[PDB]
Amino acid sequence: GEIVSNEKSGVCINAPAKTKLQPSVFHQVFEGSEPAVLNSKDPRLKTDFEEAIFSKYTGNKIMLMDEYMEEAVDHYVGCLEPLDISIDPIPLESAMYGMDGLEALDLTTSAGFPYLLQGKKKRDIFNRQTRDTTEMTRMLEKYGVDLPFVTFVKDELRSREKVEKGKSRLIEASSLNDSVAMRVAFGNLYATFHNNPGTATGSAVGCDPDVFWSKIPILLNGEIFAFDYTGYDASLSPVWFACLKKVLIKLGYTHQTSFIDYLCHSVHLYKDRKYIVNGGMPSGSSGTSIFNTMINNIIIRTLLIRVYKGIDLDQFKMIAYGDDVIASYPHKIDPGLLAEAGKHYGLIMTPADKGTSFVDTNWENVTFLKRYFRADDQYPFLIHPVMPMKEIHESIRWTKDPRNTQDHVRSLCYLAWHNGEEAYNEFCRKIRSVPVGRALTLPAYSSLRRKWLDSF
Ligand SMILES: NC(=O)C1=CN([C@@H]2O[C@H](COP(=O)(O)OP(=O)(O)OC[C@H]3O[C@@H](n4cnc5c(N)ncnc54)[C@H](OP(=O)(O)O)[C@@H]3O)[C@@H](O)[C@H]2O)C=CC1
């Protein structure tokens, strides 16, 4: 992603609010390092604010698809075909309200241009209960599609370096109109993927880690390697979008590449500004996560081929959620080498195995979706999704709405127990060393562990 232009938008797009992050009744009970920089004049910046949040954009590797890419596409198109992905579009009411494999469109995310400036809240239009499918149809009529991407900073916690640096995350929110039409072209694609995490889709988008993480080592089973990217969604040159376009063709798609063109060449509204981006995937589009994940299936296949000349991908399996990869192949590979030839397409990647001094990525030290893996003692064949306590600790020190504390820790509890009884005792002990949590309902270890085995 690279910014080709920026000019006066024509809109006085609303400056954001203050943050909603306040220290929690556990801010002093657990140890941690605070909410994201949301304006220039925040007292905590050590470099130019506006400069750090668009530096995600690093430039394109402008080019035509090379011979490796074209083969990676065919292998992935052929991994997908058993999943029979209807090119047909879903009815409008299915896009809006949902269907099997597709939740209802989410009511809280913004509607973006040009609604957010005209007093049309999506609460008004949508009206779940009646499944009313008439408002949008005249909304899409009034404004069409291919509409700008309203840009909000993410309201979230970040590490200290990222607050000091100003490395805050942006939401590039597409329009409701855009959302719906997309949801109508690829709904049964979304649906297909959502109902089928694993090696075929090569995806875990919409997986339950509590019950899907045990499937994970059976499908990979070979010699695993994993990767994390740096500024991934922005490190995408237009070409990868074309490889996605090429995949989608072999799935039998036609005029619906329009949508990926909607993502490649992107037009975003910041404040009183209109910047245009060529290459780089927007975070707010109705399939951002799905399309990121397919491109990552293309990227990886390409890197092996380009690197290991004689190669058979039939016995090659991978699983991506956005930028998070984890992959298998019978025989050993140098992920450091894929990371290398990956720079030749302008992509900064980092494998788990960092070098010969470094212990091989194994099932004990590898991660995915921020979680490590660990087999149960009793039923080893069952894999815990283990989230670091550090991660939970940092999660608990701050609150959005202190009235939503009970569910906000219960939600944390269902994640924390996979670290073991003793650690869960430590955790609940710490919680009940402070007035507020002493009355708090907590799930006991045995209850959580029972509920988990019944997920199967
Ligand atoms: N049926 C059940 O009872 C269960 C349901 N679930 C839930 O369903 C989810 C599966 O779908 P998910 O995993 O969310 O994959 P997503 O639907 O999040 O992938 C959609 C992508 O498109 C963008 N987007 C556009 N419009 C919307 C919208 N209206 N709502 C949300 N994202 C939107 C998002 O970007 P951005 O993030 O910028 O919006 C996201 O990256 C699980 O994560 C889990 O929460 C899982 C287990 C059981």
| Spatial extent as radius of gyration | 23 Å
The coarse overall form would be globular
Number of E-state strands: 14
Q: Provide the list of bound ligands, each named once.
A: NADPH dihydro-nicotinamide-adenine-dinucleotide phosphate
Give the amount of beta strand, in percent.
5-15%
In whole angstroms, how far apart are the ends? Answer: 42 Å
DSSP helical segment count = 18
What structural class do helix, strand and pairing data support? alpha+beta
Largest beta-sheet characterization: 5 strands, mixed
Spatial strand sequence of the major β-sheet? 1-7-6-3-4
Overall domain count: 3
Share of residues in helices: 25-40%
Binding site for NADPH: 106, 287, 289, 321
Organism: Human enterovirus D68
Family: Belongs to the picornaviruses polyprotein family.
Protein name: Genome polyprotein
